[PDB]
Symmetry: C3
Subunit: 333 residues, 3 copies
């Protein structure tokens, strides 16, 4: 059918780890879903030490926002590069088919905009990221990535084919940064992106991130910004890593149903302690909370988690179940 | 039902790579299974060069012992930290639900003990490890980890749902160590754990292990300590890595049935040459031996295996099958 | 049945990324399939800078050629080490059962040859590589690896069990090289392999490849050597990595059906954006092209791809489908 005859819906995106409102089960026929993103190059403090990088972002955040559509919707993205930016940007959707995921069609200089449309033919969670020719890993590792979820029109199903409905959804973007270091091991400082470039490339070539963070900074998903849930709630956590492998783990819980490589026509893996999301992939894990308290959600390379930053918290409210776990004899001499 | 009305069984653990006696198919109803572990901080020689580290262990071994129970048993662990130790320890079971896997409830100073109980609600092999707040990766990477296997009550099944019975079981714990190095590349030496700590953290932050070993040392599963089997025997190998990805491979064999991420409600992967066990996970592979001789079981990053230590041997006895493999023309000029 | 009563077929191998002619569906009963490979130690230029290594190859190429047989054929390999070589070589097939995959039976000094036969009992794609005792990772990381595909006798099937037929097949071997570097970071140069050895080992122990390439060199699968297809063609790409994990991704496409760990008795993963092939494994991905243009096929650690070399191109001819993707508003001020 002619695309002009389809309904259109405009979505306004929200900042991760939150996700724009949507329906799991498609309440309309196929639609054109309209999104707008504004590129912002900005300074960001990424750690407790106050290390500050020139970040490249979709819509002001690292990661970029989670977009949500249904299988066989059309995604129409208006991408704006304001004149206050210095660099050329584009966008590649792993969800899309052709033209380097859209990257060949979306090259915008500062002061320019473009509109891309693609059909979301495959259900799953997918990475999107910037990919300007000659400079891809630098943009991606400066924060310019996010994800898109293409739900099956009848929502998610378990390994047997019965409905799985989530009560809450969170989006964790994990970012590897590669801040250049001198012979002494201190982080170098740079006046312009072009003066940063070769040292950025050299730092990348070590394949050793200096920082690995959730939602753009060490401790971004802790304290007042901890994720929350209640006992008995079904939570979907979507987790992306555009460049580097990760292995999410909910300390004190499990992934009840996991799409480790994120594609919903496959049956989920059950009862996972830890699952591997390859670099360049988004995955999704569904868990029903059974106990209250603080949970840590970590990359289970524990060095990456507790020294380099890849750790956040859930604060869970509800009833303690002494059947599931109890202290029989509290620590004592 | 009230837990006090359940049978109780005490298990005495054995040193890896061996596994305490158990039944694959549950011969009783749900039980409380009682385990005791004693923490021992000790010096360990980890390589042929005589490099010696201050190891932190459950029950005197790296890895800690494999515990085996059935789905919906209760695990009751008595954890003892004797006054001869210097550090605070606890335990996190990935098999358990709540309170950071038990870690929030099991903090023991030297001279103290504690008893934790949890219900083993999910069948699979699972990592356990020490996780004291502020210091997790150091304890884990100093050897303080093991695994627990929660068997389905009717034992293991193949991809079709028919019984798979193992004749022998072995437990391979793979340990990444990060021994601090100076500018020249020699291994530094330290008087106390507190004086070691920052250099330990710096060494960890390289993300480059200095040693990757099976059962606590280079060559621990070779020679007189080679694993053994006979042609026609069905062997289960449980393999854990608490911190870092590994990729087991049996040189000369296969994984006939593999749970790469270790969870028994999923059908096994068949005919694997090599399988990926993510950091923070335990996996299980079942193989029926068809040829005699020496087999090497390795992490198939071959640098990790043959230079850094992640290699052991099987010595297999029985009949050579010339149908499966033969030398047609022996090496000659 | 006696092996001498089986038909014999001689195959002459072709240079990757191309694959010798074969039938997907077995047109004969079980056969002995005869292959010959000649070891060649040669100088190779591996990057745009003109960095030159002493490569060790099967049949003059990195990777070695893809061999193709059917389940329960016998593979008979004649391996020739000419007197112009300096080193001892052998071969280990992950497809074979016993004697370290053949490695214990195939040790050939320069001026010697050997013939090994094994039964291909398990369907899948499998790595083969050199594995001389005491020196395995050096040989493997100097290029001495390839793959073998053992097709099911009735060819490939989808997740439901219906036929999947490919129109073209390509073989991508991904090679991690570890060229030794001085304190300044320049690549060292060596007079003989024995003088190279310790520095090779030291470079390997960093676990940081200096180069990660497809088909033996940066840009080997670009330009005039780009892979090709037409819209609507079903392409199988076989991808191996003998030593190190990789995560293939077709920029602008997908893996419609993927065997990430390469073993055909398992159902394929559907609609993958990126898939993890563990070190020591071969995988296979099937894609039907739906759009024309240039596609990049990359390791989706984008540093590994765009800085260290792990990137090639597909040039695809055919009709552009504006339904699947279109530029609505071309980049403009
Ligand atoms: Cu950009
Ligand atoms: Cu990408
Ligand atoms: Cu401890
Ligand atoms: Cu853990
Ligand atoms: Cu060789
Ligand atoms: Cu191998």
């Amino acid at each position: 059918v002619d695309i002009s005859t389809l309904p259109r819906v405009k979505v306004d995106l929200v900042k991760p780890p939150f996700v724009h409102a949507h329906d799991q089960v498609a309440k309309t026929g196929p639609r054109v879903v309209e999104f707008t993103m504004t590129i912002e190059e900005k300074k960001l403090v990424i750690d407790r030490e106050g290390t500050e990088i020139h970040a490249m972002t979709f819509n002001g955040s690292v990661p970029g926002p989670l977009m949500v559509v249904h299988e066989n919707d059309y995604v129409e993205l208006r991408l704006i590069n304001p004149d206050t930016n210095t660099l050329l940007h584009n966008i590649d959707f792993h969800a899309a088919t052709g033209a380097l995921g859209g990257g060949a069609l979306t090259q915008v200089n500062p002061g320019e905009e473009t509109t891309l449309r693609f059909k979301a033919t495959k259900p799953g969670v997918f990475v999107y990221h910037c990919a300007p020719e000659g400079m891809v890993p630098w943009h991606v590792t400066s924060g310019m990535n996010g994800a898109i979820m293409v739900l099956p029109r009848d929502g998610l199903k378990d390994e047997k084919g019965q409905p799985l409905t989530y009560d809450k959804i969170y989006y964790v973007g994990e970012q590897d940064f590669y801040v250049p270091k001198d012979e002494a091991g201190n982080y170098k400082k740079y006046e312009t992106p072009g003066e940063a470039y070769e040292d950025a490339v050299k730092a990348m070539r070590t394949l050793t991130p200096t920082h690995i963070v959730f939602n753009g900074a060490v401790g971004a998903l802790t304290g007042d910004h901890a994720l929350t849930a209640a006992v008995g709630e079904r939570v979907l956590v979507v987790h992306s890593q555009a460049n580097r492998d990760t292995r999410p783990h909910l300390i004190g819980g499990h992934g009840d149903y996991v799409w480790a490589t994120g594609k919903f026509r496959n049956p989920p893996d059950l009862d996972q302690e830890t699952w591997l999301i390859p670099g360049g992939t988004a995955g999704a894990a569904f868990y029903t909370f059974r106990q209250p308290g603080v949970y840590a959600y970590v990359n289970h390379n524990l060095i990456e988690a507790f020294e380099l930053g890849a750790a956040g918290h859930f604060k869970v409210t509800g009833e303690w179940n002494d059947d599931l776990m109890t202290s029989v004899v509290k620590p004592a001499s």
